[PDB]
């Protein structure tokens, strides 16, 4: 029963003997009752179903739950000591399953030795519907700082540069990186002196874009873009330039990638962030090549229709809230 409203809220039955004692979990979501049928039953209040039932050799007289919830203490009819039971939900993940009400536990647990519609859990889908705009949950630092990389990085450097000895040799060992920007480093006892055209000449990101235009599929390219960090992103976009060795054809594939992302209306903030970094890097070269402009024409149409709808909805919500404050 609820004390405030004086009405019955849950009804529990299934014990085959007189109930000796009851106890509550500290959160209040679990009811534990001990009966003379030598069984201890745990009831889940929010759902109103039995979730645990284990038998004992001796009838339990008293039951008590720790205020922290780590242990459960019980006493028996003829024993002279207190027995502790550890709640394994704290140190391990357990999935509650609804037991039938008319359940009898066959297995007995010795006291002192160490050895559905009913359930309540839900998983959200990736997208509720295609027209509905969704944002990914990548960490904020990966994409919010793309436009301000240059100013942030110099503040990180110390005020006084490191003291470097003159006698130090030219070459020091190198650490390649968390993610390989280039797919292949070498082609066991082969030579290390090689002519040109043997080592890799195109980034793994660049390779996917060239394959992408053929099949109109850019998800593989979209995946490599989303693990590498903002420093890695700037390198890949800078390397895309014809001066840096990326063909003008390849940028078209990148621009169709952004249009593909806005079409699905998923990962919206990454599409805005990636496009913005591209615009800063190659805005001077952009107007000259006519192939790129028609992609910009489609991209400009999509961004204005998307933002206007959300900006309107954001604005009306804020003005009402400010009105309530005054």
């Amino acid at each position: 029963l609820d004390i405030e409203t004086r009405k019955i809220v849950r009804e529990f039955s299934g014990h085959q003997g007189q109930i000796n004692d009851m106890a509550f979990s500290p959160d209040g979501r679990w009811l534990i009752s001990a009966a003379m049928d030598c069984s201890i039953r745990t009831w889940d209040l929010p759902s109103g179903c039995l979730i645990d039932c284990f038998l004992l050799d001796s009838a339990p007289l008293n039951v008590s739950m720790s205020p922290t919830g780590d242990f459960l203490a019980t006493s028996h009819v003829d024993h002279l000591g207190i027995y502790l039971w550890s709640n394994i939900s704290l140190y391990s993940v357990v999935s509650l399953r609804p037991l039938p009400a008319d359940y009898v536990p066959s297995i007995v647990m010795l006291p002192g030795t160490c050895q559905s519609d009913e359930l309540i859990e839900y998983d959200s889908p990736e997208q509720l519907n295609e027209q509905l705009v969704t944002l990914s949950l990548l960490p904020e630092s990966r994409w919010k700082n793309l436009l301000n990389l240059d100013v942030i990085k110099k503040k990180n450097k110390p005020k006084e540069p490191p003291k470097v000895p003159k006698s130090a040799p030219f070459f020091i060992p190198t650490i390649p990186g968390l993610v390989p920007r280039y797919a292949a480093p070498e082609q066991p006892q082969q030579s290390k002196v090689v002519n040109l055209g043997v080592l890799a000449q195109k980034s793994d990101f660049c390779l996917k874009l060239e394959e992408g235009l053929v099949n109109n599929k850019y998800d593989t390219a979209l995946n490599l873009l989303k693990e590498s960090g903002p420093s890695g992103i700037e390198t890949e976009l800078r390397s895309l330039s014809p001066d840096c060795g990326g063909s003008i054809e390849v940028m078209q594939s990148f621009l169709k990638m952004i249009g593909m992302m806005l079409d699905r209306k998923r990962d919206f903030e990454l599409a805005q962030a990636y496009l913005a970094l591209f615009l800063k890097l190659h805005l001077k070269m952009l107007p000259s090549e006519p192939v790129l402009l028609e992609e910009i024409t489609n991209l400009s149409s999509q961004v204005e229709e998307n933002w206007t709808h959300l900006q309107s909805l954001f604005n009306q919500s804020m003005c009402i809230l400010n009105y309530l404050k005054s």
Partner: protein, 267 residues
Amino acid sequence: SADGHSILAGGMSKFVCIYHVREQILMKRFEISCNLSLDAMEEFLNRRKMTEFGNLALIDQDAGQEDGVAIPLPGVRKGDMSSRHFKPEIRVTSLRFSPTGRCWAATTTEGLLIYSLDTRVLFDPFELDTSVTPGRVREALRQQDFTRAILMALRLNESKLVQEALEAVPRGEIEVVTSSLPELYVEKVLEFLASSFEVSRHLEFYLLWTHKLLMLHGQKLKSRAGTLLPVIQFLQKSIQRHLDDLSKLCSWNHYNMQYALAVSKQR
């Protein structure tokens, strides 16, 4: 507190006391720290450490002051030159509660402590009945009776049930549900939406929800605006957050393309 129904007090202790102001009783005592490497933590000092000539704390004191860096000075209460620096006494220097109302902070000797609202701590249903159960909730979802399912899921205060109920509703039926929703549950739905914006991928779905509830019920909520300040501010900041960085990015794209679309014309 933001609502004003409870008060928090602290001082020369490891305990922060929360009182109900009208009933003039202590609701709860929180233990800030259990570290026994700080002085005055326990009421009774251990009898084990006693010898005939006392506990001889000065020897352990000098063992602590072997840290160096400065020189101890007699009579300094706090600082590096204080004698009692290696084992500072426990103190709650200051307490403050968030205007949003979902957390509170305290400055103590250990550091800055933050305590936030968690559903796992306490089960607090509003209006229970034997009919109110998640099975009936999913049943009403299956018969497309959205209003009753949402209401009865709101009578429960489990966030996953109302999450599933709201996400099950398709668009276009939002306004019917908002109109059918009574006045009392409006604040509950707003609080749930404000909690949702932080950790939900579906921003603009809940934005449509918030827009509908606000646009129908703003005039009625204006009269009772004084008691709803902790909620509204909460909602506001959430709606602020996403908005600002979107406002930073999309415009930075938009106008820029037009400038390029300008240059394409001029040649």
